[model samples]
Target chain A: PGMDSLPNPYLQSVSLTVCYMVKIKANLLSPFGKNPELQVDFGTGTGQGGDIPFRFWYCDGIVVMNTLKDGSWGKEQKLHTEAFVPGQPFELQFLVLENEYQVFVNNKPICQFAHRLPLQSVKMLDVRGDIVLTSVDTL
Target chain B: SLPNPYLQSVSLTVCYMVKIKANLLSPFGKNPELQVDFGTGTGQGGDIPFRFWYCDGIVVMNTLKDGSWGKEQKLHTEAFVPGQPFELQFLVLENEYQVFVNNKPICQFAHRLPLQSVKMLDVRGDIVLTSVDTL
Candidate 1:
């Protein structure tokens, strides 16, 4: 309950909305449980209007673990792909590692996001439409 | 006073092994475009695996996995349904071939061919191989 003294660390100040971009909404079901650590990192700039324009170089994606005893989504982050769109449907693959997440869009290498934050405690995994979580095999 | 041809041969051998390892690591899956739809149509197989060899400015596409090395080359294709579209691309860097399908990169293959004097662009497509000279 001491977390009540701190603000929502996952709170994002910016939102990306483009014709071919991913939109994410975060809903906190409850407060952080005992011994909670929060860390967030931003990605590259894709230079699109209303779009983050940030190119996550197979390394900028976010990973969250540990359920807070509430029905909230697990660690979540948004990536903008307007700059790398090649005029067709695509698939994004997340290579879930023990500590980091490697992201690939349409099979192309996009980001190699490292995880300084703790995520082995994650619970719910959710992605809005257009964002495909092809496979999440553990290694 | 002559250069050692044996040394040259050893260098080539090392290069060849590196090429094989590079291909195996990246481009792990077969091409989705070659698969057939409904499991009952043209190109009705799993995904066809691919490897790239760069010679000069030309790129050589080779299908992976052959049941018989002494027999004719048998390339397989993944299942593809009508109206289902997929595309794979690659960034030809100086040393690596960064592959992207449907605009996303699934893997990267290293270039082992000569970068010039490469004129033949060979592609093996089973089932129905469609080509257009004018895009």
Candidate 2:
């Protein structure tokens, strides 16, 4: 009740069109144990975004993108490419739309992730683990 | 002979330790940075014991001496991932500056500036730093 007295950003943002983007460029590190990934959190701090988490992972020979929603994981998508070398740099982008996220690798269409939660609820982004994080950009 | 007046009370000893976590905010994390100067101060004309440059996929490590930077060496790991919280550690040795990121050994920069000459600890960056610790 008292929180209502303060400016409610969620109330303000819920009405606007929700469009966000995440772009990362990186090179996989060696030793094969270090699996790098990118993650995004919804309602991370105050926990208001909803019960959902999205992550993109890179295994030795496959790249996977999945999310958690409604207390369970949604369908997992994978792109198998054993030819994925560790030295070359690859760029990944998640273009968020009202209903789905278009995934791209090296400017090529990879997959589309349908949003389980409202896209406007996204609050945080993370890119780490087992790789050389070259750069990150978002909107 | 011993130097004139003392540098007065200080912390971050020659062989001290530092552990802390930092957050990456967008717009800034694109080229974020954090550094430790093993020398007494910036007034010392570049006696950096060891330095860390915000990695771009592969991080860079080196030292500053003779009022300029030394040969650049690259380490194959990264820290300061945007929108992420990272725990890092620093354990200073006589000839090594051990840097660990997220509970893993990233790399060690062999000391070019003597540990004894260390009198100050300096950190600079625009990171959402958590409370830092020195042990």
Candidate 3:
């Protein structure tokens, strides 16, 4: 059910100063499917680049590596979790603090990606493509 | 000590461009404590927000919203914003809740509160709080 909703194009409010914490529960399929690697986009419609926060945190029933977005799926981050079950709710705690994106999974401290571009004008958050969110909230 | 929700401990790495602003206020009452303001602006629903605030007394948790449903568990403190601004404070013992903007703690609430339940974690909505925007 994650991909059911397109990126909300209604940019009701656009501001250069904003921070958001999105909590999405897996209502349908986990963002990562049977693929060895899957890219979860965190921006607006069609799950394009730059707008959405690029989050790669899943592995098939094999060796888990840090999924990088250099055009193609690169190495993994040694995330030793096999596969996430469907409908199993997972918590993603993202902090847009300073120059990096701090993300935590299920309350477990995870990776910290150096935010490449300026996230100042980022006002839209979309969970497109494969991820499913049973519940999502923002403030 | 054993793992107890009443005395649960969790640390966070914060990194933010905005300045850290929080104070001890008697919004709830003059119980000798201060409220930690995670988000400076007014809180609105559908925005991901997370605030770690604790106090000496046991913070009660009741499902007030209609769309929200879960356990009515109490807490030493709880910080999650579906909509609107919320405040939390640390009370009795030498409780420490570090504030990380990105991966750094801009400030520290070194207040003391009688910490109660820390294990009753409620991660339902957005963990991100829009405190400020860019130029």
Per-candidate DockQ values are 0.03, 0.01, 0.07
- List the candidate 1 regions with Cα displacement exceeding 4 Å: A1-87, A129-139, B1-135
Model 1 CAPRI rating: incorrect
Ranking by DockQ: 3, 1, 2
Q: How close is candidate 2 at the interface, in terms of C-alpha RMSD after superposing the true interface residues? A: 18.5
Q: Per-residue error at B11 for model 2, in Å?
A: 5.4
Query: Candidates' interface RMSDs, in order?
Result: 16.8, 18.5, 10.2
Runs of candidate 2 with Cα error greater than 4 angstroms are: A1-139, B1-15, B42-44
- Chain A TM-score of model 1 comes to 0.34
Cα lDDT tens digits for candidate 3, A1-139:
2255324221223222224454444433433335423234343222344344344445453223232243455444454542354455566555554566555556545666666445564545544334444455433
C-alpha lDDT values of all predictions: 0.28, 0.57, 0.36
lDDT of 2 by residue, A1-139 (tens): 1211111111111211223446666666565445543333332233433355566666677777776665567788777754346667777666554567766666566666777666655555545655566566554
Cα error of candidate 1 at position A129, Å: 4.2
Candidate 2 lands at a TM-score of 0.42
TM-score of 1: 0.23
TM-score comparison, 1 vs 2, better candidate: 2
